[PDB]
Amino acid sequence: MTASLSNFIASLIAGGVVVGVIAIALIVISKSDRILR
Amino acid sequence: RPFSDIITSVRYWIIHSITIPSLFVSGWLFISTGLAYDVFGTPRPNEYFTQDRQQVPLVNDRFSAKQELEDLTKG
Amino acid sequence: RIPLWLVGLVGGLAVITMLSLFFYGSYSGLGSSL
Amino acid sequence: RGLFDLVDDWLKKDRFVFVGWSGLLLFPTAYLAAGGWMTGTTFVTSWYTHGLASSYLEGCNFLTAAVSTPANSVGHSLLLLWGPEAQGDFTRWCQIGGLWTFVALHGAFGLIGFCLRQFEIARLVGIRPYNAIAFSGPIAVFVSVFLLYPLGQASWFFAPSFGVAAIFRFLLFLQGFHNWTLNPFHMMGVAGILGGALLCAIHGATVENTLFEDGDAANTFRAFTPTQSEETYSMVTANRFWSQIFGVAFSNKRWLHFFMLFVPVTGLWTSSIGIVGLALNLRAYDFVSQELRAAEDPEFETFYTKNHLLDEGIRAWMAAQDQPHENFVFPEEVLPRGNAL
Amino acid sequence: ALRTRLGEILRPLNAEYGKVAPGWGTTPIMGIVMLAFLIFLVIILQIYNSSLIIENVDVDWANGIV
Amino acid sequence: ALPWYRVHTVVLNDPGRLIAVHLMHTALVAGWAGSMALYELAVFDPSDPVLNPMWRQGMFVMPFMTRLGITDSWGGWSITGESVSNPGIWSFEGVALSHIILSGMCFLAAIWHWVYWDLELFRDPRTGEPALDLPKIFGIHLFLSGLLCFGFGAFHVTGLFGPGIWVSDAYGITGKVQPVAPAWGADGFNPFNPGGIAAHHIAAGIFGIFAGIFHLTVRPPQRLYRALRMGNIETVLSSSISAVFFAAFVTSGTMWYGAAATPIELFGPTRYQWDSGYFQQEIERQVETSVSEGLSESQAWSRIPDKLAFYDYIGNNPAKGGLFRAGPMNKGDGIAEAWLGHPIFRDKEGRELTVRRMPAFFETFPVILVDKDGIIRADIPFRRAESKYSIEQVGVTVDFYGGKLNGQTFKDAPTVKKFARKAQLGEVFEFDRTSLESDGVFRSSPRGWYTYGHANFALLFFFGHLWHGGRTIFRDVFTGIGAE
Amino acid sequence: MTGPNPNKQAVELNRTSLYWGLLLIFVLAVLFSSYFFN
Amino acid sequence: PLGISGTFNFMLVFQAEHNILMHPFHMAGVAGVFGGSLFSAMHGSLVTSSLIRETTENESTNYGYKFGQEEETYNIVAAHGYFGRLIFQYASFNNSRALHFFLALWPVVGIWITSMGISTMAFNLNGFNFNQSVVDSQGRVINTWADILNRANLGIEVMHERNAHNFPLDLA
Amino acid sequence: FRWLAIHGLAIPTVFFLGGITAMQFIQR
Amino acid sequence: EVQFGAYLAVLLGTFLPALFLVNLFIQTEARKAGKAGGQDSD
Amino acid sequence: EVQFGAYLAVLLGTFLPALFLVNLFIQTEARKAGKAGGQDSD
Amino acid sequence: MEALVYTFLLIGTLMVIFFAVFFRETPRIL
Ligand code: CLA
Ligand code: CLA
Ligand code: CLA
Ligand SMILES: CCCCCCCCCCCCCCCC(=O)OC[C@H](COP(=O)(O)OC[C@@H](O)CO)OC(=O)CCCCCCCCCCCCCCC
Ligand SMILES: CC1=C(/C=C/C(C)=C/C=C/C(C)=C/C=C/C=C(C)/C=C/C=C(C)/C=C/C2=C(C)CCCC2(C)C)C(C)(C)CCC1
Ligand SMILES: CC1=C(/C=C/C(C)=C/C=C/C(C)=C/C=C/C=C(C)/C=C/C=C(C)/C=C/C2=C(C)CCCC2(C)C)C(C)(C)CCC1
Ligand code: OEX
Ligand SMILES: [Fe+2]
């Protein structure tokens, strides 16, 4: 609700999408590059 | 593919004969157009000292440090 | 196909043009105490 | 089968650089500590924090460039880019000295992520994890100097800046103000570093000089196939050599190579304990029996009291320009000079 | 292998050994707690560091009631 | 055939003697804390708790008894100074003697639990081999620690059934053991709020009660039982150590930076109360309001307590001591007697000169007299030849206000130089250096020593996390690896 | 009592590791004495 | 001076009068002993990692080596595949002879070069001197880290042998 | 593919060397 | 003036741990002479 | 005022002869465990 | 009185160096 508290939760959301776009890209490519049995 | 088989190939040097000078000159123009002094806030040789401020500028506050550097970089 | 020693020659003298350029500007320009 | 198994099989695949699970912590954080240092020594100045020049834009070479510690007014703030000090601006973040904590924090999570890399590869190859335990040595020097030393002090300002000559003043700042060389924890650390360099110079030069003839060529590097079961140097000869030169010698290759692990690493752990004791200013500054005697007897001089007068010169002469935030204005007549210097 | 009277009471607490819940179980419930406890430690550190300012929370030596 | 560094691994496959050993470490820890506190009562002197508190006399474990509510002793003295007729059982001597009696009984129980190692409780009823059900042992032992956390915060701290926490004011003058009502808001995470400590152990005790209710009933998954190796007992030790140095950076952190759980009336002031001038600005503030209420100057400085000026002294900074010098801080310069007063330096022009104060870094510091705007006006010159700012030229006179030098004025250069040197060390005190053979160099407070041990410990236990942790995961290959 | 423990082992220290541990203590005694006497 | 505190009287006075830290031969031997203690503990760990099972878990690890045996006591292919994945493949010595030569090269070359740093600074060919090297366009001296290092050297220079000097320049 | 592995390290390096050669010719 | 508790620190810091390491060697050689069965086992 | 060489007399008069008598007992039990041949001889 | 301890530590260190060189456990093949 302050300047400092509102900016921190926005960084927490921004810290979620940085983990997110790495994770979402990693699941999709792990489907295509599976190893033959 | 082996690494030494890549750089001896011609098709390698076809691509990277354009990309290296187009990227080295962009690193030249990043400096000569005076752009790097404004992104990173580094002083030019003209502007270490000013006419008013003749001492060494320092930050002297925890929380208004952004406002104090708005003071010391206008003049 | 290019011989590999030609590649290390041209890139190797390219580094010398980069390094000796850096020892040039120790005696000219900024940081030269002129 | 499941979703976890496909991700586990993809990361551990044989490829150019082994990624693994630990590469998600190493490769983002190590890339930004290294790139934060190359940017901060090239572009970002120290004109507002220290009142110096520490960039390549400002004429400094490789030696006199650094990523510098922030101001003393910042205190121990983490200096987040979105924080109360920088407030989202990139340019004011760099001028306060925000890249230094950016390098040190993402660097501290690189050394976490690199030591986890050494546990993960050892489990896949199937070996004992002594590389990950010997690398804990250098973790104890990064943490207890770049992190635990400015925390005990007044701010991040008293930390080593990430530059070549900026480490060099930190070596000189720690003698005059702390008497660091007198500390027995450095003395046990020099014994491990000069002792560790000793062991690889001997074991390098004794293996290479008791080699067997495995070929007719004069070059002995050619005569070793890696998958051979015969040992490549005579251990009995090398024992017989040093038992007569030095008097005592290793008779155990398993004990020898373990001893080459213990000696360098312990010198980084014992020296790391002392630098935690200098965050608290618990320094080994004086021998009081030497100091009480030199006060009462103005003729008693040792080499030890000669080092205190060298430290008054470090505490007085550099501290004017060292700490511009405190505004030390010394007169010319208080600075301790010698005779005619 | 010596039956004691206190050993007879506590015996059903040790009688199970190595029974597991088959599958992944309550592992995704745990990670949501661990993601939450990671955010909790970040917040109370930044309160303490004065890098997260909360209104009517001042990190300074306060007058405890005497 | 065990090496000397593996002698205590005979207890790996023996739960019955795992307890007898863990009871013997307990009988030595408890016997230490009893015999340390008996040693401290032979050394403590409750003559003047204002200028000789317990943190000057090097008392280490004694500020941990008075933190949780022990002020009286069987001698009749108290740390609060109020006399008592009877402290009952729980005094300083009662606690010290009860940690000894607890040590003697954990000693005798460890003789039992070592001899009678073969109990049916530790056998597996399905295989017969000695096993410990580590998931349910964790459920029991976490449910107990939920009760002792919630029981502590609700009853000992809040004063429902207990004395409470030592609290204090902002400036270390008044302090007493009192019940503390919890603060549940965001103000609870202010660590200088003592209500946050009560709110913590009440809240987090409930989370520890109902996590033991979880970790009793629900069995581990098949994946996590194999991945974290929960059949092995060393995965308990690998991760218990991680939960122990993590706790030791916190306590060494909040001791060093200060918290409500570390009052400056018990452990001494922090170094950040010298660097920011936390007591210099406060002593002036109680004089700026006194002079504004129509007073003479010497009557304004006489209202200042001797305790408040005693914190404004560089010898009470924990960042001034050394490592291999030993003993209490009273070994430093002697037991303080009285406050000599507040010297005010004025030149022949009449302006006010303040002595520049020594920072915590400098062992030696040149005496410099500075006026209000930062201009160097006087000093004591090293080189006396070309002197331009000496006290003889400037003619600095000293004026005391308050203390035992209340109205006095010294005007000559021999006497002003003696008070200019001792005024850069904070306030000015009269000490007694002949009782303890005080040599003349500063020592450290128990705030400084606690931060030393428990942060050099926590760095060593980080290596134990990597040793015992990598020993758990890699268990099949510690005789060596196979060549195939 | 109960039965004999099957976890009885033996402790070893060869003549080599004696001289390491003796020299370890005396060199730490040489190093840290000067600071303790102060 | 043949002592311990006399060594640090020697090192500090040598710093003020010769500026050894900026001299590139002390730089080439700090790299010799930091590198030397690296490759010591890096080689000593990869042998101890890849030891072959010859003992039990009760006795010592070291007793799986009988003295004078002819069998190799560690899987060298194992430690090559580890370091071949820890950095990358081509940075690993499969040759144990060229590996045990690089352990002898790096420190010894680093201390030959360093000991000819003291030698060339015995004849007053000092290290680098970047004092007052960065100036603005006005010409005022902008400080660097070498200027802060200079003020530490000026403190030791004006205080070493505080009575032996009579003339303004320490020629000796 | 390893084109993202090298060129995350080489595309910056040539860009900074384009700036370090330009700073040799900058004077006051 | 030196601290008189430092004599107790050093001379017990020498003797108590060094006499410990002697004991682990004497019982090592006694077990080796114990198994060997000749003239010294008893 | 007490004699400060008496701490060294007593605490070495305790420890040095008492640690001696412990050693003769430990090597006694090691020889008995040495001959016995089971689980502890090595 | 103080330097007597330092001398005893030094010559006591040189004793165990003497015994380690000459009374060493001589390693033997087979
Ligand atoms: C919670 C604490 C804890 C516990 C219970 C253990 C338990 C164990 N450790 Mg471990 N360890 C710990 C912390 C702990 N460790 C830490 C912090 C480190 C880092 C230093 C290590 C490093 C370590 C190694 C490197 C090894 C062990 C080993 C062992 C096993 C046998 C111990 C032994 O034979 O020593 C016997 C010790 C002695 C006979 C004498 C030791 C003398 C010490 C060094 C000085 C005297 C101690 C001193 C009085 C203590 C003061 C108290 C202080 C701790 C506050 C055992 C399972 C061994 C193992 O893996 O088992 C196979 C082993 O090789 N540990
Ligand atoms: C009603 C809600 C409530 C309230 C008001 C509190 C109140 C508090 N809690 Mg608590 N807590 C609660 C519920 C609550 N708790 C619940 C439900 C849980 C879950 C069981 C916890 C778990 C918890 C933990 C685990 C901790 C607290 C702490 C605290 C204190 C925070 C202020 C402080 O000094 O932290 C200071 C802030 C920190 C110390 C941040 C920790 C981050 C670490 C130190 C980072 C570094 C780690 C690394 C290994 C160190 C080495 C690196 C080095 C280089 C720096 C305060 C007493 C902290 C405490 O007790 O400290 C005194 C603490 O550590 N709480
Ligand atoms: C019968 C119980 C009992 C009681 C009431 C006391 C009482 C006391 N002891 Mg004592 N003690 C006891 C048993 C007891 N002792 C035993 C059995 C031992 C041997 C282990 C000791 C060893 C001991 C020592 C060594 C010392 C004391 C001290 C003290 C005094 C201050 C306590 C203090 O500050 O601790 C503070 C306690 C803590 C900070 C513990 C924190 C617990 C950590 C943070 C737990 C975190 C992990 C948790 C389990 C995770 C799950 C949380 C979950 C709820 C979510 C106090 C008079 C001190 C003193 O002055 O001695 C005279 C002192 O130094 N005690
Ligand atoms: C004129 C020249 C003649 C030669 C001079 C003789 C001096 C030689 C010094 C003897 C070393 C004795 C240490 C015993 C050590 C001991 O006996 O070890 C014996 C050990 C033999 O190990 P093994 O392979 O027999 O062990 C196999 C297993 O049993 C391991 O336990 O040899 C070494 O490893 C020693 C190598 C390092 C040597 C360490 C020397 C450190 C230098 C000395 C530091 C002290 C100096 C202090 C002075 C104040
Ligand atoms: C900071 C930051 C960032 C960024 C990052 C990155 C991305 C970076 C990168 C960067 C990089 C990564 C850099 C690089 C650089 C490089 C360089 C610049 C190099 C150089 C080189 C040299 C100079 C060398 C030399 C040589 C040669 C060439 C050869 C011979 C040898 C020698 C060594 C001499 C971000 C965005 C996140 C944001 C935040 C902050
Ligand atoms: C039997 C019995 C009894 C008795 C008991 C007793 C009397 C107790 C005591 C006990 C004791 C009295 C104990 C003590 C202990 C102590 C300890 C255990 C200590 C130790 C410590 C340590 C070892 C440490 C170390 C160190 C040092 C020294 C220095 C620095 C470092 C360190 C810290 C590491 C009774 C009658 C009650 C009851 C019945 C039975
Ligand atoms: O003698 Mn020994 O140190 Ca070579 O510099 Mn000149 O001389 Mn004396 O002064 Mn500085
Ligand atoms: Fe080797």
Ligand 7 binding pocket includes H164 (Cβ within 6 Å) = yes
Of G15, G19, G29, the CB nearest to L9: G29
Spatial separation of the C-alpha atoms in residues D204 and J40, rounded to whole Å? 44
- Separation of CA F360 and ligand 7 centre (Å): 33
Contact call for J2 and D289, based on CB within 8 A: yes
Q: CA D215, D217, D220: angle at the middle one, nearest 5?
A: 75
Q: CA B61, B63, B69: angle at the middle one, nearest 5?
A: 65
Spatial separation of the C-alpha atoms in residues D61 and H22, rounded to whole Å? 12
Rg value, chain H, Cα = 25
Spatial separation of the C-alpha atoms in residues F462 and H36, rounded to whole Å? 25
Per DSSP, the three-state class of C7 is: helix
Ligand 4 binding pocket includes G24 (Cβ within 6 Å) = no
Give the total residue count for chain D. Answer: 341
Spatial separation of the C-alpha atoms in residues F315 and F360, rounded to whole Å? 10
D246 neighbors L21 (Cβ within 8 angstroms):
no
Task: Give the nearest chain D residue to A18 (CA atoms).
Answer: D28
For residue H142, list its beta bridge partners: H134
At residue F90, what are phi and psi to the nearest 5 degrees?
A: -90, 85
What is the experimental method? cryo-EM
Spatial separation of the C-alpha atoms in residues H161 and F243, rounded to whole Å? 54
B37 token code pair: 């002094």
Contact residues of ligand 2, CB 6 A cut-off: D 143, 147-148; E 41, 44-45, 48; F 184, 188-189, 191, 196-197, 199-200, 203-204, 207, 246, 249-250, 253-254, 259
F246 token code pair: 């993590």
H45 Cβ contact list (under 8 Å, min separation 6): D130, D131, D133, D134, D261
Task: Note which residues in 1-40 of chain J have CB less than 8 A from chain K.
Answer: 4, 7-8, 11-12, 15-16, 19, 22-23, 26-37, 40
What's the distance, CA B25 to chain centroid? 14
J6 neighbors G36 (Cβ within 8 angstroms):
yes
E12 neighbors F121 (Cβ within 8 angstroms):
no
End-to-end CA distance of chain G: 52
Spatial separation of the C-alpha atoms in residues H124 and H118, rounded to whole Å? 10
Per DSSP, the three-state class of D60 is: coil
- Separation of CA F33 and ligand 6 centre (Å): 8
Spatial separation of the C-alpha atoms in residues I2 and H170, rounded to whole Å? 60
- Separation of CA D309 and ligand 7 centre (Å): 15
3-class DSSP string for F141-189: HHHHHHHHHHHHHHHHHCCCCCCCEEEECCCCCCEEEECCCCCCCHHHH
**Following CA atoms I11, I12, I14, I17 in sequence, which dihedral angle do they give, to the nearest 10 degrees?**
180
**Residue D281 DSSP one-character state:** T
Name the nearest CA neighbour of F223 among D288, D31, H104, E21. Answer: E21
Residue nearest to atom 33 of ligand 6 (CA): F453
Closest ligand 6 atom to F453 CA: 33
CA dist list (Å): C7 to B9, C11, F139, H67, I12: 11, 6, 67, 51, 22
The answer to whether F1 contacts chain H (CB < 8 Å) is yes
Contact call for D337 and F383, based on CB within 8 A: yes
Side-chain-side CA neighbours of K40 within 13 Å: the count stands at 19
DSSP line for F80-91: S----S---S-S
User: Residues of D5-32 as b/e, b for ≥16 C-beta within 10 angstroms?
Assistant: ebbeebbeeeeeebbbebbbbbbbbbeb
Contact call for D77 and E49, based on CB within 8 A: yes
For residue D211, list its beta bridge partners: D233
D304 neighbors H5 (Cβ within 8 angstroms):
yes
For residue F354, list its beta bridge partners: F370
Contact call for K40 and G9, based on CB within 8 A: yes
At residue F96, what are phi and psi to the nearest 5 degrees?
A: -65, -40
Per DSSP, the three-state class of D13 is: coil
Name the nearest CA neighbour of F68 among F49, F48, F90. Answer: F90
Contact call for E23 and F223, based on CB within 8 A: yes
Which of F41, F70, F95, F99 should be mutated for ligand 3, with most atoms under 8 A from CB? F99
Chain B and chain H touch, per 3+ beta carbon pairs within 8 A: yes
Return the axis-axis angle of helices D253-276 and H24-49, rounded to nearest 10°. Answer: 130
Of F320, F324, F388, the CB nearest to D281: F320
D71 Cβ contact list (under 8 Å, min separation 6): B58, B59, B60, B65, D48, D49, D96, D97, D155, D157, D325
Name the nearest CA neighbour of K37 among F242, J41, E25. Answer: J41
Q: Which amino acid would we find at residue H86?
A: L
Ligand 7 binding pocket includes H87 (Cβ within 6 Å) = no
**H-helix or E-strand spanning residue D37:** helix D23-42
List the chains bordering chain B where 3 or more Cβ pairs fall under 8 Å: C, D, H, I
CA dist list (Å): F97 to F65, F103, F104: 13, 10, 11
F412 neighbors F391 (Cβ within 8 angstroms):
no
Chain I and chain E touch, per 3+ beta carbon pairs within 8 A: no
At residue F330, what are phi and psi to the nearest 5 degrees?
A: -70, -20
Return the axis-axis angle of helices H145-157 and H5-18, rounded to nearest 10°. Answer: 120
The answer to whether C31 contacts chain B (CB < 8 Å) is no
Task: Note which residues in 179-238 of chain D have CB less than 8 A from chain L.
Answer: 236
Spatial separation of the C-alpha atoms in residues F121 and F132, rounded to whole Å? 9
**H-helix or E-strand spanning residue F360:** none
Rg value, chain B, Cα = 22
Q: Positive or negative, the Cα torsion across F89, F95, F99, F104?
A: negative
**Following CA atoms H30, H33, H39, H44 in sequence, which dihedral angle do they give, to the nearest 10 degrees?**
-150
Spatial separation of the C-alpha atoms in residues F452 and F446, rounded to whole Å? 10
Spatial separation of the C-alpha atoms in residues H1 and H14, rounded to whole Å? 13
D115 neighbors D139 (Cβ within 8 angstroms):
yes
DSSP line for F217-261: HSPPBHHHHHHTTTTSSHHHHHHHHHHHHHHHHHHHHHHHS-BTT
C14 burial level (CB within 10 Å; 0-12, 13-18, 19+): exposed
Residue numbers in A near D9 (CB within 8 A): 30, 34-35
Residue nearest to atom 42 of ligand 1 (CA): F5
User: Residues of F189-222 as b/e, b for ≥16 C-beta within 10 angstroms?
Assistant: bbbbbbbbbbbbbbbebeebbebbeebbeebbbe
DSSP line for H83-148: HHHHT-STTS---HHHHHHHHHHHHHHHHHHHHHHHTTTTTT------TT-EE-SS-PEEP-HHHH
Ligand 7 binding pocket includes H12 (Cβ within 6 Å) = no
Residue nearest to atom 34 of ligand 5 (CA): C19
Tell me the residue ranges of DSSP E strands in K1-42. none
Residue numbers in D near A4 (CB within 8 A): 83-84
CB-CB neighbours of F104 under 10 Å = 13
**H-helix or E-strand spanning residue F391:** helix F391-394
Contact call for E55 and A2, based on CB within 8 A: yes
- Separation of CA D19 and ligand 5 centre (Å): 22
To which residue do tokens 């009440």 refer? F202
Name the nearest CA neighbour of D286 among D307, D272, D300. Answer: D307
Residue numbers in J near L2 (CB within 8 A): 2
DSSP line for D125-183: HT---HHHHHTHHHHHHHIIIIIHHHHHSSSGGGSPPEEHHHHHHHHHHHHHTT-GGGS
To which residue do tokens 């000869």 refer? D237
Spatial separation of the C-alpha atoms in residues F344 and F423, rounded to whole Å? 10
Ligand 7 binding pocket includes H156 (Cβ within 6 Å) = no
Report which bound ligand comes closest to the CA of H156: 7
Chain A and chain J touch, per 3+ beta carbon pairs within 8 A: no
User: Residues of D130-156 as b/e, b for ≥16 C-beta within 10 angstroms?
Assistant: bbbbbbbbbbbbbbbbbbbbbbbbbbb
Resolution (A): 3.8
**Residue F58 DSSP one-character state:** T
Per DSSP, the three-state class of H2 is: coil
What's the distance, CA G1 to chain centroid? 32
At residue F206, what are phi and psi to the nearest 5 degrees?
A: -65, -40
3-class DSSP string for chain E: CCCCHHHHHHHHHHCCCCCCECCCCCHHHHHHHHHHHHHHHHHHHHHHCCCCCCCCCCCCCCCCCC
Contact call for C2 and B4, based on CB within 8 A: no
**Residue D194 DSSP one-character state:** H
Spatial separation of the C-alpha atoms in residues D138 and D193, rounded to whole Å? 12
